[PDB]
Amino acid sequence: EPQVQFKLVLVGDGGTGKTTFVKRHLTGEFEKKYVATLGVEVHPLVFHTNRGPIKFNVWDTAGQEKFGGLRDGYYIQAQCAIIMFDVTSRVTYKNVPNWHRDLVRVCENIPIVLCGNKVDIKDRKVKAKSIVFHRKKNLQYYDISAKSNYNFEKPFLWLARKLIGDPNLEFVAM
């Protein structure tokens, strides 16, 4: 059934919190345990805007190589992406350029948000200052916590604004 919707592919190292971020948005539940995603899981997230609903069909992909499934095959027809890493784990940050490259080789020009997750944890190893990923046109960075809900909506508001071409789109109380 016709509606305003976008395919969003969520990628990033295992453990960085991709599935946890999606479930909170989906049901409000915070998942404590690590249960690695097998290939991909698809869920729709609906946001109510001042131009009515926007739907993101979120493909939550596996970050562990062993469980990758179709890998960059899942990116086919993606209209936007989120790359996630763990602010507490330098290796997950150092893999961001590769996740980025894998995305652009399949989706030449799409809007992408880099999310540095788990900022609720005392000592970060990746400081928000030193991020340079978001310096170009269709790219953006936010600190996020899937657990404290810091900057909960920002990635989706920024994506929606880019995809619709309206800089003053808001997420309104339905």
Binding site: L70, S148, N149
Partner: protein, 859 residues
Amino acid sequence: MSTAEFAQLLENSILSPDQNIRLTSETQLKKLSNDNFLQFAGLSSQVLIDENTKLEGRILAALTLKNELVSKDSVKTQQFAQRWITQVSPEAKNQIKTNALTALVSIEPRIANAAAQLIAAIADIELPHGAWPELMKIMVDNTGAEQPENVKRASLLALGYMCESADPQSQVSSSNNILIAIVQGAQSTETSKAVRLAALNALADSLIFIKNNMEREGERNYLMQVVCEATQAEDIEVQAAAFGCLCKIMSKYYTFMKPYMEQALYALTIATMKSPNDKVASMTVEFWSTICEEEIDIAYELAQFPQSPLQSYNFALSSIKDVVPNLLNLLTRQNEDPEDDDWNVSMSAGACLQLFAQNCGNHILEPVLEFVEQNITADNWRNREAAVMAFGSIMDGPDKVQRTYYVHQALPSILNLMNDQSLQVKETTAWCIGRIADSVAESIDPQQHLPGVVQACLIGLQDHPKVATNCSWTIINLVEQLAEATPSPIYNFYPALVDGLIGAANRIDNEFNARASAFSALTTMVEYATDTVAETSASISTFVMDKLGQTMSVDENQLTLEDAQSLQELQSNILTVLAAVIRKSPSSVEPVADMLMGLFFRLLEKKDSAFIEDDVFYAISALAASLGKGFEKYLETFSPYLLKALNQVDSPVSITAVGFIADISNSLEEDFRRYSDAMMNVLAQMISNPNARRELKPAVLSVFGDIASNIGADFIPYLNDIMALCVAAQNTKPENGTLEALDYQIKVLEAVLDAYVGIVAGLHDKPEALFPYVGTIFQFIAQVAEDPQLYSEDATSRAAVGLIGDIAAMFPDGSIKQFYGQDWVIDYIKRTRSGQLFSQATKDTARWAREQQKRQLSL
């Protein structure tokens, strides 16, 4: 299986609405590649070139074969190479490659792009082996200027993929200069922008691969000339890509850059930096950041290796005259719209100005401060905001004397800008004040400037939320830096600051994080609170307890997902402050511990407590530690949460649960009897749990020590079980041979000590109870005597030598005298009394052990 059926599988994997149809197809594809790779590889190549298959399926056909040829994991990389080399027939390999080269030249770009990835993957496997020797000629021929646009573009893209993918070179032959092929596609004689882009991007992908070429002046001069021309192209995306290449070249081949910087690169990057086009200026700013970043890195390397043949050319340092004023001018291209949070050229300019300050230190001051002095009172807000941004941007790099001095001059005018009409001026001013607090807090004279800074922050908290947020951040810096001064001037302002922060925390929403940051600031206020400002801590705890109350008497059934998640963010914020209050001022909440525990239990009782459970468990545990005996009223209703926590033997929470058992045993002291039977049986099952994480075993073994020392004769029923756990633990060897595995055995052994010290202290009046185990205790003391990693720890030896003494004191009737005439015991006591190796406390305890040992032998 036929082409069409395989295409159907591919298409259904990613296009079917039915999620089970997708899984099923994905599973069958993987099964096929496993069972019969030869067939799977052929079929994939056939779907890639088939006009009757949907686009998405053809792309997936290329991608999926590629992902069975190449991998992130270098073990699978070798298996994939060998499976291609050995299982696919020469005929099949030839067809597959032929089909790939046919897709490459498809009139559909997205098919061509996915073909390029497939070609790169095959090439990664075959080129080291000199298989596919036709490929390099085909790619070079395809990039000839006269070839069709799509053929040139797709082949440049493939060459680039191929080059960034070949192993740290070592495979790299003469016929077909790859460099000339790529650089020619970048020439201004190319009509097609798509081809020049493809060329410049392929060139960037190939820079590590073409190293030997770059080290030949002729080839290098030519490449630099073409890339530099490209920067001056009409098309903005071609310009971007040209500067993209320059950045990469500067950072890989810095060592060859002096001649080009002097001939033409310098003057053009300066000119381009004044461009009225924002994107064009950013590109050139990027290049100068890369230069700065490199030279900073070179300086670090040269400090660690002073004889290095590597030399800085100090490009950034030499450029200040020209670059810095142009950067400063770029600061006045801020975005008008306060709701736009995108990166723009003015932010690139600020970032680069900061790198310049770090690189060049004091040399940056004159041009920046000329600018600040000229613009801080300009009529245009853009010039006023650039002024403070420039000033804040040099608060790191120049020495402390210069920064302190210029802060003293600027600060009054900076503080006055908190009254500006312009939102963006106020927002940057609060940020600037923050930077001054963070890097040069002693520059803020306690008498002349601190009152003004505090007032500025207080005004800021009441302003636009974006300004407020920066004020909360600036307050945190002020307090973290000034709370440690010895005559500490900040505590004079705690009440004013706490009051402003509470007001900010009371905002109706969390626009621009104004509310969340206020709660972080409040956490800092609490963390650094001294006794002289105890009243203001009480304010904070009263405020957040009341706010936590509000958040829980909302109409749950009418709350949207959006509403609830905001509410839960606020509860997390609140708990951070309550944790700090409990850690720091446990006394300023115990008068209302009854209502605090009320809130905590209600929080835990809700389903959807998962996000906050641990926070609350930590909080209660730390509160329990402060209440002592006063916490016993909450134990019954806290019980199942403790047990849930004790049973998550894989979570860090169980470690603190064990700690909690230790705390209430120490506070209830003799009254811990009531709970001892339930606690012991739970601790017993945790320690003999296979899945218990490593830290639990010793934590448990120590807490047996605690309990026994608090509970005296009431420990006797557990004595026999616990002693068996200790014997078993003390005879366990390291799991392997690593440092890690050995350090853990010792951590276990230190925990057995704790158990035996506690038990001996506990059974002081009941020696008969300890008597049967004295042999086993000495077996342990013998291990302490034997292992350096135990005996050389001053604490461990003092405890061990203490046991020798204390056990002797317990049996004056001679019943254990035989343990005291052994060679190893005498020598251990002597050693513990001897060198400089152990401390006076340790030596005095050895002296006592020596006296008790002597008394035993004469019995």
